[PDB]
C-alpha cells in the first residue's frame, strides 16, 4: 500500500502495537560474540543491546579492537551510517578513535547528557575554547572551536588532533536538544529541519566516511533519523514513490544492527516524518522551501 493512506488506516484501526510486533517478528538475528566476552563487559551500556559480528566496526588496535558501533550500509539509497551507543566514561577515547579511523565529518547526537534525572551518555566533547580535552589511551586531542545554540538544536565545530601524527581534521557536532523525556514529539517538523541541516553540511555525503549517530542506545531516536533520511533519498531517486515501503527498509536496516526502532510510538513517528517530508522536497514543493 502506499504510505499515506496506509498511515491513516493504522490510525483508525489502532493496530499499530500489531504491526510493530510483527517486525520484531520478522527482523533478522545474527550472532553478536565478540560484544559478550568477559573483558568487553563496561564496554556495553545496555546488556540487550550489541552489535552483530558481521557488521559490527572495528577499532584499528591489536589488544582490544572492540566498541558497540555497526554499520548500516543502504545499497540503492547509496547512504551509509554508523550507529553507536552514548559513550560511556571508559569508552569516550575508543568513541573518538573510531571518528578519527573511520574518516567522519559529522557526529550527530539526539539525546541530553541527562534525562529523566540519569546520565545517559557521558559529557565526552568540550564546553569552553579554551579547556580543552585530551584522551590519554587513544592520543588524541580535541578542541571546540564554536558553537551556535538554536530553538531546537545546537550545532558545534570541533578540531580532533591525532597526536601520534599532528594530523588535524574538523568534525561538526549536531546535537538535536529538545526530544522529550517520554514518548516522541507531537509534530516532525523540527526533527526534519534538523535532518535537513545536517544534510546541507556534507555530513552525509560519500566524499566523506559514514556520519557517527548515537541516542543512549543507539536505536531508537538514531533508527529514526536513518530510516527517515533513507525513505526520503529513496523517494526523489525512484520512478514511483508511492513505492517505497518504510516497513521493507526497516527490516533491511536491522540486517546490519538490532532493535531499531524501540516502540510503535517511534514507528508512527517515522511514518510521519517521511509523509511530512516528502511534501516539503518538492514537485509540490516551492523551490524557496530549501530556504524555509
Ligand atoms: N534540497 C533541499 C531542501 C529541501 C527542503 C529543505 N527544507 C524544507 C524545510 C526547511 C528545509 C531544505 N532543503
Redesign the pocket.
Request: proline share 0%; no cysteine.
Given at each position: 500500500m502506499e504510505m499515506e493512506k496506509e498511515f491513516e488506516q493504522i490510525d483508525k484501526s489502532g493496530s499499530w502495537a500489531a504491526i510493530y510486533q510483527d517486525i520484531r517478528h520478522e527482523a533478522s538475528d545474527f550472532p553478536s560474540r565478540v560484544a559478550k566476552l568477559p573483558k568487553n563487559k563496561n564496554r556495553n551500556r545496555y546488556r540487550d543491546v550489541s552489535p552483530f559480528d558481521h557488521s559490527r566496526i572495528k577499532l584499528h588496535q591489536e589488544d582490544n579492537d572492540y566498541i558497540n558501533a555497526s554499520l548500516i550500509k543502504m545499497e540503492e539509497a547509496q547512504r551509509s551510517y554508523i550507529l553507536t551507543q552514548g559513550p560511556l566514561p571508559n569508552t569516550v577515547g575508543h568513541f573518538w578513535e573510531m571518528v578519527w579511523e573511520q574518516k567522519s565529518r559529522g557526529v550527530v547526537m539526539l539525546n541530553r547528557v541527562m534525562e529523566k534525572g540519569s546520565l545517559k551518555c557521558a559529557q565526552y566533547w568540550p564546553q569552553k575554547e579554551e579547556k580543552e580535552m585530551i584522551f590519554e589511551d587513544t592520543n588524541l586531542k580535541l578542541t571546540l572551536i564554536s558553537e551556535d545554540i538554536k530553538s531546537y538544536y545546537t550545532v558545534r565545530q570541533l578540531e580532533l588532533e591525532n597526536l601520534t601524527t599532528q594530523e588535524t581534521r574538523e568534525i561538526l557536532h549536531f546535537h538535536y536538544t529538545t526530544w522529550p523525556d517520554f514518548g516522541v514529539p507531537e509534530s516532525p517538523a523540527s526533527f526534519?529541519?534538523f535532518l535537513?541541516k545536517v544534510r546541507?553540511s556534507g555530513s552525509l555525503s560519500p566524499e566523506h566516511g559514514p556520519v557517527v549517530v548515537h541516542c543512549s542506545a543507539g536505536i531508537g531516536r538514531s533508527g529514526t533519523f536513518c530510516l527517515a533520511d533513507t525513505c526520503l533519498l529513496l523517494m526523489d531517486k525512484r520512478k514511483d514513490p508511492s513505492s517505497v515501503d518504510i516497513k521493507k527498509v526497516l527490516l533491511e536496516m536491522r540486517k546490519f544492527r538490532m532493535g531499531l526502532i524501540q516502540t510503535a510510538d517511534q514507528l508512527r513517528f517515522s511514518y510521519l516524518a517521511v509523509i511530512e517530508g516528502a511534501k516539503?522536497?518538492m514537485g509540490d514543493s516551492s523551490v524557496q522551501?530549501?530556504w524555509?
Open positions: 526534519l529541519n535537513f546541507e516539503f522536497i522551501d530549501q524555509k
